Amino acid sequence: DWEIPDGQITVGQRIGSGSFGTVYKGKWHGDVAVKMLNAPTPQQLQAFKNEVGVLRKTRHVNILLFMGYSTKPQLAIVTQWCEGSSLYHHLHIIETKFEMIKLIDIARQTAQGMDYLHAKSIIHRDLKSNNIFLHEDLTVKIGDFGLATSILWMAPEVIRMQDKNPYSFQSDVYAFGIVLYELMTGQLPYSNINNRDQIIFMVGRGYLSPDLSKVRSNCPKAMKRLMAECLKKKRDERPLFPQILASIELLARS
Ligand SMILES: CNc1ncc2cc(-c3cc(NC(=O)NCCC(C)(C)C)c(F)cc3C)c(C)nc2n1
């Protein structure tokens, strides 16, 4: 079992809070991250069993490591502690300038993790650079580091919400396409539009899409074509991760 026996965790500094939990740094055989999700309602009890259920199906280096869960006093999920910042932070907050080979490597490791989740029939549903951690500044850890459950990474069919369920291996691929655009541009899509509602309406109709012409000239053609393919408006034109990963792997070998 992964139940952490009671009172073994030394909860330290609070890292963040939102409507759906509070996250702390803890001590449990070393540093850990602890997310505490509250007396708990049945909506909350169910979301807890779901996240635990999904986490415990994963053992891969590019996916954040689940370590256990506590049930009392509060519902809590315990994972490894990550050191450093999200890809979002590096690209758009402290604007780190990475060597092309490092951008491509970030791309590779994210594709590795996603390929993995999908091999297990796990749809992420919220992949964004903010949920890509660069641990030790070198290793990608995909998780969900947010506390609020996000439109720039949302596939057109997700926005319309007309074919519901709209989430699919392919909506994840789209999001990943938006991550590659960030990698290869240093920027978020649609930065010259300052109106959320319109981006929403325009992406969902296919009126607006990421400006691929902004892609750095030192980016390999093959990476640019991969981006355009992932970003495809009609979901089943998008490659899946086995194909996505093989491409990044192929181009890196050059
Ligand atoms: C800042 N460092 C750091 N390290 C580790 C961190 C770990 C988490 C975290 C994240 C999750 N959830 C989580 O990552 N869910 C998505 C998993 C999936 C990719 C398999 C679909 C959790 F259940 C518990 C915790 C503690 C969070 C929210 N933030 C973290 N922050």
Side-chain angles (χ1 to χ4, degrees), residues 23 33-35 51 54-55 58 63-64 77 79-82 117 122 124 133 142-145:
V23 179
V34 190
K35 179 216 209 158
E51 195 165 16
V54 167
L55 276 173
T58 59
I63 298 310
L64 172 83
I77 314 205
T79 63
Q80 71 183 123
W81 173 257
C82 288
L117 301 174
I122 297 161
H124 192 304
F133 213 95
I142 289 158
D144 177 327
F145 306 97

PDB file of all heavy atoms in Angstrom, residues 23 33-35 51 54-55 58 63-64 77 79-82 117 122 124 133 142-145, ligand 1:
ATOM      1  N   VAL A  23      -0.728  23.294  -1.491  1.00  0.00           N
ATOM      2  CA  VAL A  23       0.476  22.511  -1.668  1.00  0.00           C
ATOM      3  C   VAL A  23       1.588  22.981  -0.726  1.00  0.00           C
ATOM      4  O   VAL A  23       1.851  24.190  -0.585  1.00  0.00           O
ATOM      5  CB  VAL A  23       0.915  22.505  -3.143  1.00  0.00           C
ATOM      6  CG1 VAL A  23       2.199  21.706  -3.339  1.00  0.00           C
ATOM      7  CG2 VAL A  23      -0.204  21.915  -3.989  1.00  0.00           C
ATOM      8  N   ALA A  33       6.563  16.778  -2.065  1.00  0.00           N
ATOM      9  CA  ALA A  33       5.528  17.772  -2.260  1.00  0.00           C
ATOM     10  C   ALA A  33       4.266  17.141  -1.689  1.00  0.00           C
ATOM     11  O   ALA A  33       4.043  15.941  -1.885  1.00  0.00           O
ATOM     12  CB  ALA A  33       5.368  18.086  -3.711  1.00  0.00           C
ATOM     13  N   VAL A  34       3.483  17.931  -0.948  1.00  0.00           N
ATOM     14  CA  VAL A  34       2.178  17.481  -0.421  1.00  0.00           C
ATOM     15  C   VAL A  34       1.026  18.394  -0.857  1.00  0.00           C
ATOM     16  O   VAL A  34       1.082  19.604  -0.728  1.00  0.00           O
ATOM     17  CB  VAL A  34       2.176  17.339   1.130  1.00  0.00           C
ATOM     18  CG1 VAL A  34       0.893  16.650   1.607  1.00  0.00           C
ATOM     19  CG2 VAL A  34       3.398  16.590   1.605  1.00  0.00           C
ATOM     20  N   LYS A  35      -0.001  17.788  -1.411  1.00  0.00           N
ATOM     21  CA  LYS A  35      -1.164  18.510  -1.858  1.00  0.00           C
ATOM     22  C   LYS A  35      -2.297  18.005  -1.004  1.00  0.00           C
ATOM     23  O   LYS A  35      -2.573  16.794  -0.934  1.00  0.00           O
ATOM     24  CB  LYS A  35      -1.420  18.273  -3.341  1.00  0.00           C
ATOM     25  CG  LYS A  35      -2.636  18.969  -3.918  1.00  0.00           C
ATOM     26  CD  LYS A  35      -3.258  18.058  -4.951  1.00  0.00           C
ATOM     27  CE  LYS A  35      -3.973  18.784  -6.051  1.00  0.00           C
ATOM     28  NZ  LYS A  35      -4.058  17.849  -7.224  1.00  0.00           N
ATOM     29  N   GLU A  51      -7.469  10.995  -8.815  1.00  0.00           N
ATOM     30  CA  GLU A  51      -6.103  11.433  -8.990  1.00  0.00           C
ATOM     31  C   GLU A  51      -5.129  10.363  -8.462  1.00  0.00           C
ATOM     32  O   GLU A  51      -4.128  10.031  -9.123  1.00  0.00           O
ATOM     33  CB  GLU A  51      -5.867  12.810  -8.373  1.00  0.00           C
ATOM     34  CG  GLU A  51      -4.575  13.458  -8.842  1.00  0.00           C
ATOM     35  CD  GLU A  51      -4.486  14.951  -8.539  1.00  0.00           C
ATOM     36  OE1 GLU A  51      -5.264  15.475  -7.706  1.00  0.00           O
ATOM     37  OE2 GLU A  51      -3.619  15.617  -9.146  1.00  0.00           O
ATOM     38  N   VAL A  54      -5.022   7.520 -10.893  1.00  0.00           N
ATOM     39  CA  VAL A  54      -4.268   7.776 -12.111  1.00  0.00           C
ATOM     40  C   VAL A  54      -2.769   7.817 -11.827  1.00  0.00           C
ATOM     41  O   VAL A  54      -1.995   7.200 -12.547  1.00  0.00           O
ATOM     42  CB  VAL A  54      -4.767   9.031 -12.855  1.00  0.00           C
ATOM     43  CG1 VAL A  54      -3.795   9.443 -13.923  1.00  0.00           C
ATOM     44  CG2 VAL A  54      -6.126   8.749 -13.493  1.00  0.00           C
ATOM     45  N   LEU A  55      -2.367   8.512 -10.766  1.00  0.00           N
ATOM     46  CA  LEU A  55      -0.946   8.617 -10.415  1.00  0.00           C
ATOM     47  C   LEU A  55      -0.262   7.250 -10.201  1.00  0.00           C
ATOM     48  O   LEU A  55       0.868   6.996 -10.693  1.00  0.00           O
ATOM     49  CB  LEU A  55      -0.752   9.553  -9.221  1.00  0.00           C
ATOM     50  CG  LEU A  55      -0.699  11.033  -9.629  1.00  0.00           C
ATOM     51  CD1 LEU A  55      -0.677  11.989  -8.476  1.00  0.00           C
ATOM     52  CD2 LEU A  55       0.518  11.265 -10.466  1.00  0.00           C
ATOM     53  N   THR A  58       1.382   5.158 -12.880  1.00  0.00           N
ATOM     54  CA  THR A  58       2.549   5.704 -13.587  1.00  0.00           C
ATOM     55  C   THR A  58       3.901   5.463 -12.890  1.00  0.00           C
ATOM     56  O   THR A  58       4.065   5.717 -11.689  1.00  0.00           O
ATOM     57  CB  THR A  58       2.403   7.207 -13.825  1.00  0.00           C
ATOM     58  OG1 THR A  58       2.265   7.861 -12.565  1.00  0.00           O
ATOM     59  CG2 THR A  58       1.199   7.502 -14.660  1.00  0.00           C
ATOM     60  N   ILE A  63       7.405  11.523 -15.887  1.00  0.00           N
ATOM     61  CA  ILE A  63       6.164  11.766 -15.219  1.00  0.00           C
ATOM     62  C   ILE A  63       6.463  11.932 -13.779  1.00  0.00           C
ATOM     63  O   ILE A  63       7.242  11.215 -13.255  1.00  0.00           O
ATOM     64  CB  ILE A  63       5.133  10.649 -15.420  1.00  0.00           C
ATOM     65  CG1 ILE A  63       4.764  10.509 -16.889  1.00  0.00           C
ATOM     66  CG2 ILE A  63       3.893  10.940 -14.671  1.00  0.00           C
ATOM     67  CD1 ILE A  63       4.382  11.756 -17.567  1.00  0.00           C
ATOM     68  N   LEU A  64       5.817  12.886 -13.148  1.00  0.00           N
ATOM     69  CA  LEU A  64       6.025  13.218 -11.769  1.00  0.00           C
ATOM     70  C   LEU A  64       5.792  12.047 -10.832  1.00  0.00           C
ATOM     71  O   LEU A  64       4.834  11.402 -10.949  1.00  0.00           O
ATOM     72  CB  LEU A  64       5.078  14.345 -11.443  1.00  0.00           C
ATOM     73  CG  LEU A  64       4.913  14.818 -10.040  1.00  0.00           C
ATOM     74  CD1 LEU A  64       5.920  15.735  -9.675  1.00  0.00           C
ATOM     75  CD2 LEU A  64       3.653  15.395  -9.897  1.00  0.00           C
ATOM     76  N   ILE A  77      -2.148  14.142  -1.304  1.00  0.00           N
ATOM     77  CA  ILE A  77      -1.372  13.400  -2.238  1.00  0.00           C
ATOM     78  C   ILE A  77       0.027  13.892  -2.104  1.00  0.00           C
ATOM     79  O   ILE A  77       0.244  15.031  -2.001  1.00  0.00           O
ATOM     80  CB  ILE A  77      -1.887  13.552  -3.609  1.00  0.00           C
ATOM     81  CG1 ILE A  77      -3.356  13.383  -3.568  1.00  0.00           C
ATOM     82  CG2 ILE A  77      -1.412  12.484  -4.445  1.00  0.00           C
ATOM     83  CD1 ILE A  77      -3.893  12.956  -4.775  1.00  0.00           C
ATOM     84  N   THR A  79       4.004  13.460  -3.573  1.00  0.00           N
ATOM     85  CA  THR A  79       4.777  13.120  -4.746  1.00  0.00           C
ATOM     86  C   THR A  79       6.171  13.542  -4.402  1.00  0.00           C
ATOM     87  O   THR A  79       6.384  14.081  -3.323  1.00  0.00           O
ATOM     88  CB  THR A  79       4.330  13.928  -5.993  1.00  0.00           C
ATOM     89  OG1 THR A  79       4.561  15.318  -5.754  1.00  0.00           O
ATOM     90  CG2 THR A  79       2.876  13.735  -6.280  1.00  0.00           C
ATOM     91  N   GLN A  80       7.107  13.315  -5.326  1.00  0.00           N
ATOM     92  CA  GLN A  80       8.466  13.838  -5.203  1.00  0.00           C
ATOM     93  C   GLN A  80       8.431  15.367  -5.125  1.00  0.00           C
ATOM     94  O   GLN A  80       7.464  16.004  -5.560  1.00  0.00           O
ATOM     95  CB  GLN A  80       9.334  13.403  -6.382  1.00  0.00           C
ATOM     96  CG  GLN A  80       8.968  14.096  -7.711  1.00  0.00           C
ATOM     97  CD  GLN A  80       9.796  13.592  -8.878  1.00  0.00           C
ATOM     98  OE1 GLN A  80       9.244  13.116  -9.880  1.00  0.00           O
ATOM     99  NE2 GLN A  80      11.147  13.664  -8.745  1.00  0.00           N
ATOM    100  N   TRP A  81       9.481  15.950  -4.558  1.00  0.00           N
ATOM    101  CA  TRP A  81       9.643  17.374  -4.603  1.00  0.00           C
ATOM    102  C   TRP A  81      10.414  17.745  -5.856  1.00  0.00           C
ATOM    103  O   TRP A  81      11.420  17.110  -6.191  1.00  0.00           O
ATOM    104  CB  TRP A  81      10.392  17.859  -3.393  1.00  0.00           C
ATOM    105  CG  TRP A  81      10.694  19.304  -3.532  1.00  0.00           C
ATOM    106  CD1 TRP A  81      11.893  19.861  -3.858  1.00  0.00           C
ATOM    107  CD2 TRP A  81       9.770  20.385  -3.412  1.00  0.00           C
ATOM    108  NE1 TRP A  81      11.784  21.212  -3.921  1.00  0.00           N
ATOM    109  CE2 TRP A  81      10.489  21.568  -3.649  1.00  0.00           C
ATOM    110  CE3 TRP A  81       8.403  20.469  -3.105  1.00  0.00           C
ATOM    111  CZ2 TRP A  81       9.894  22.834  -3.582  1.00  0.00           C
ATOM    112  CZ3 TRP A  81       7.809  21.726  -3.038  1.00  0.00           C
ATOM    113  CH2 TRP A  81       8.558  22.890  -3.282  1.00  0.00           C
ATOM    114  N   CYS A  82       9.963  18.776  -6.553  1.00  0.00           N
ATOM    115  CA  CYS A  82      10.686  19.203  -7.737  1.00  0.00           C
ATOM    116  C   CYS A  82      11.479  20.453  -7.443  1.00  0.00           C
ATOM    117  O   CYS A  82      10.986  21.352  -6.766  1.00  0.00           O
ATOM    118  CB  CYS A  82       9.721  19.467  -8.893  1.00  0.00           C
ATOM    119  SG  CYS A  82       9.005  18.002  -9.609  1.00  0.00           S
ATOM    120  N   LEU A 117       1.955   8.186 -20.915  1.00  0.00           N
ATOM    121  CA  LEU A 117       0.609   8.343 -20.382  1.00  0.00           C
ATOM    122  C   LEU A 117      -0.395   7.721 -21.335  1.00  0.00           C
ATOM    123  O   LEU A 117      -1.346   7.054 -20.914  1.00  0.00           O
ATOM    124  CB  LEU A 117       0.259   9.809 -20.118  1.00  0.00           C
ATOM    125  CG  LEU A 117       1.121  10.613 -19.142  1.00  0.00           C
ATOM    126  CD1 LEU A 117       0.710  12.102 -19.106  1.00  0.00           C
ATOM    127  CD2 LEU A 117       1.096  10.031 -17.771  1.00  0.00           C
ATOM    128  N   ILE A 122      -4.141   7.234 -20.467  1.00  0.00           N
ATOM    129  CA  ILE A 122      -4.263   8.430 -19.639  1.00  0.00           C
ATOM    130  C   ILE A 122      -4.224   9.623 -20.574  1.00  0.00           C
ATOM    131  O   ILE A 122      -3.248   9.810 -21.315  1.00  0.00           O
ATOM    132  CB  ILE A 122      -3.121   8.555 -18.624  1.00  0.00           C
ATOM    133  CG1 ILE A 122      -3.162   7.386 -17.645  1.00  0.00           C
ATOM    134  CG2 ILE A 122      -3.210   9.914 -17.917  1.00  0.00           C
ATOM    135  CD1 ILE A 122      -1.860   7.132 -16.896  1.00  0.00           C
ATOM    136  N   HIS A 124      -4.027  13.527 -20.473  1.00  0.00           N
ATOM    137  CA  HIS A 124      -3.693  14.564 -19.526  1.00  0.00           C
ATOM    138  C   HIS A 124      -4.739  15.664 -19.284  1.00  0.00           C
ATOM    139  O   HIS A 124      -5.063  15.993 -18.178  1.00  0.00           O
ATOM    140  CB  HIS A 124      -2.399  15.198 -19.974  1.00  0.00           C
ATOM    141  CG  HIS A 124      -1.777  16.081 -18.958  1.00  0.00           C
ATOM    142  ND1 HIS A 124      -2.436  17.135 -18.402  1.00  0.00           N
ATOM    143  CD2 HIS A 124      -0.567  16.055 -18.380  1.00  0.00           C
ATOM    144  CE1 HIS A 124      -1.657  17.733 -17.537  1.00  0.00           C
ATOM    145  NE2 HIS A 124      -0.522  17.087 -17.494  1.00  0.00           N
ATOM    146  N   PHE A 133       7.686  20.503 -15.745  1.00  0.00           N
ATOM    147  CA  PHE A 133       8.723  20.943 -14.857  1.00  0.00           C
ATOM    148  C   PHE A 133      10.077  20.568 -15.336  1.00  0.00           C
ATOM    149  O   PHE A 133      10.289  19.515 -15.842  1.00  0.00           O
ATOM    150  CB  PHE A 133       8.520  20.359 -13.471  1.00  0.00           C
ATOM    151  CG  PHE A 133       8.960  21.227 -12.385  1.00  0.00           C
ATOM    152  CD1 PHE A 133       8.090  22.044 -11.757  1.00  0.00           C
ATOM    153  CD2 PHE A 133      10.254  21.215 -11.964  1.00  0.00           C
ATOM    154  CE1 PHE A 133       8.513  22.840 -10.764  1.00  0.00           C
ATOM    155  CE2 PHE A 133      10.654  21.994 -10.994  1.00  0.00           C
ATOM    156  CZ  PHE A 133       9.785  22.816 -10.386  1.00  0.00           C
ATOM    157  N   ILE A 142       6.263  15.873 -16.198  1.00  0.00           N
ATOM    158  CA  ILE A 142       4.918  16.256 -16.495  1.00  0.00           C
ATOM    159  C   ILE A 142       4.077  15.984 -15.266  1.00  0.00           C
ATOM    160  O   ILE A 142       4.162  14.918 -14.690  1.00  0.00           O
ATOM    161  CB  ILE A 142       4.388  15.463 -17.693  1.00  0.00           C
ATOM    162  CG1 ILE A 142       5.062  15.934 -18.968  1.00  0.00           C
ATOM    163  CG2 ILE A 142       2.870  15.633 -17.853  1.00  0.00           C
ATOM    164  CD1 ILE A 142       4.990  14.905 -20.017  1.00  0.00           C
ATOM    165  N   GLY A 143       3.265  16.945 -14.861  1.00  0.00           N
ATOM    166  CA  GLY A 143       2.275  16.701 -13.828  1.00  0.00           C
ATOM    167  C   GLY A 143       1.144  17.645 -14.039  1.00  0.00           C
ATOM    168  O   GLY A 143       0.873  18.043 -15.157  1.00  0.00           O
ATOM    169  N   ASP A 144       0.463  17.982 -12.963  1.00  0.00           N
ATOM    170  CA  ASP A 144      -0.484  19.073 -12.965  1.00  0.00           C
ATOM    171  C   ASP A 144      -0.099  19.879 -11.772  1.00  0.00           C
ATOM    172  O   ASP A 144      -0.483  19.546 -10.657  1.00  0.00           O
ATOM    173  CB  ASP A 144      -1.935  18.598 -12.793  1.00  0.00           C
ATOM    174  CG  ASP A 144      -2.963  19.793 -12.722  1.00  0.00           C
ATOM    175  OD1 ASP A 144      -2.651  20.908 -12.196  1.00  0.00           O
ATOM    176  OD2 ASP A 144      -4.112  19.629 -13.219  1.00  0.00           O
ATOM    177  N   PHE A 145       0.638  20.952 -11.992  1.00  0.00           N
ATOM    178  CA  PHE A 145       1.076  21.764 -10.883  1.00  0.00           C
ATOM    179  C   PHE A 145       0.133  22.894 -10.534  1.00  0.00           C
ATOM    180  O   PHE A 145       0.499  23.774  -9.759  1.00  0.00           O
ATOM    181  CB  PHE A 145       2.486  22.261 -11.146  1.00  0.00           C
ATOM    182  CG  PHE A 145       3.426  21.160 -11.461  1.00  0.00           C
ATOM    183  CD1 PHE A 145       3.719  20.841 -12.767  1.00  0.00           C
ATOM    184  CD2 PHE A 145       3.967  20.386 -10.450  1.00  0.00           C
ATOM    185  CE1 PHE A 145       4.584  19.784 -13.064  1.00  0.00           C
ATOM    186  CE2 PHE A 145       4.828  19.341 -10.744  1.00  0.00           C
ATOM    187  CZ  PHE A 145       5.132  19.040 -12.049  1.00  0.00           C
TER     188      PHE A 145
HETATM  189  C1  LIG B   1       7.319  23.417  -6.976  1.00  0.00           C
HETATM  190  N1  LIG B   1       7.695  22.015  -6.910  1.00  0.00           N
HETATM  191  C2  LIG B   1       6.751  21.040  -6.934  1.00  0.00           C
HETATM  192  N2  LIG B   1       7.105  19.734  -6.847  1.00  0.00           N
HETATM  193  C3  LIG B   1       6.178  18.772  -6.892  1.00  0.00           C
HETATM  194  C4  LIG B   1       4.837  19.107  -7.008  1.00  0.00           C
HETATM  195  C5  LIG B   1       3.841  18.123  -7.023  1.00  0.00           C
HETATM  196  C6  LIG B   1       2.512  18.527  -7.128  1.00  0.00           C
HETATM  197  C7  LIG B   1       1.413  17.525  -7.125  1.00  0.00           C
HETATM  198  C8  LIG B   1       0.695  17.192  -8.281  1.00  0.00           C
HETATM  199  C9  LIG B   1      -0.314  16.241  -8.211  1.00  0.00           C
HETATM  200  N3  LIG B   1      -1.057  15.849  -9.277  1.00  0.00           N
HETATM  201  C10 LIG B   1      -0.623  15.653 -10.527  1.00  0.00           C
HETATM  202  O1  LIG B   1       0.545  15.895 -10.859  1.00  0.00           O
HETATM  203  N4  LIG B   1      -1.567  15.202 -11.375  1.00  0.00           N
HETATM  204  C11 LIG B   1      -1.393  14.913 -12.804  1.00  0.00           C
HETATM  205  C12 LIG B   1      -0.827  13.506 -13.018  1.00  0.00           C
HETATM  206  C13 LIG B   1      -0.792  12.921 -14.423  1.00  0.00           C
HETATM  207  C14 LIG B   1       0.285  13.581 -15.264  1.00  0.00           C
HETATM  208  C15 LIG B   1      -0.347  11.492 -14.227  1.00  0.00           C
HETATM  209  C16 LIG B   1      -2.137  12.997 -15.144  1.00  0.00           C
HETATM  210  C17 LIG B   1      -0.629  15.677  -7.001  1.00  0.00           C
HETATM  211  F1  LIG B   1      -1.636  14.801  -6.951  1.00  0.00           F
HETATM  212  C18 LIG B   1       0.062  16.002  -5.839  1.00  0.00           C
HETATM  213  C19 LIG B   1       1.096  16.930  -5.889  1.00  0.00           C
HETATM  214  C20 LIG B   1       1.815  17.239  -4.596  1.00  0.00           C
HETATM  215  C21 LIG B   1       2.194  19.895  -7.215  1.00  0.00           C
HETATM  216  C22 LIG B   1       0.750  20.363  -7.341  1.00  0.00           C
HETATM  217  N5  LIG B   1       3.187  20.830  -7.206  1.00  0.00           N
HETATM  218  C23 LIG B   1       4.481  20.448  -7.092  1.00  0.00           C
HETATM  219  N6  LIG B   1       5.447  21.381  -7.053  1.00  0.00           N
END
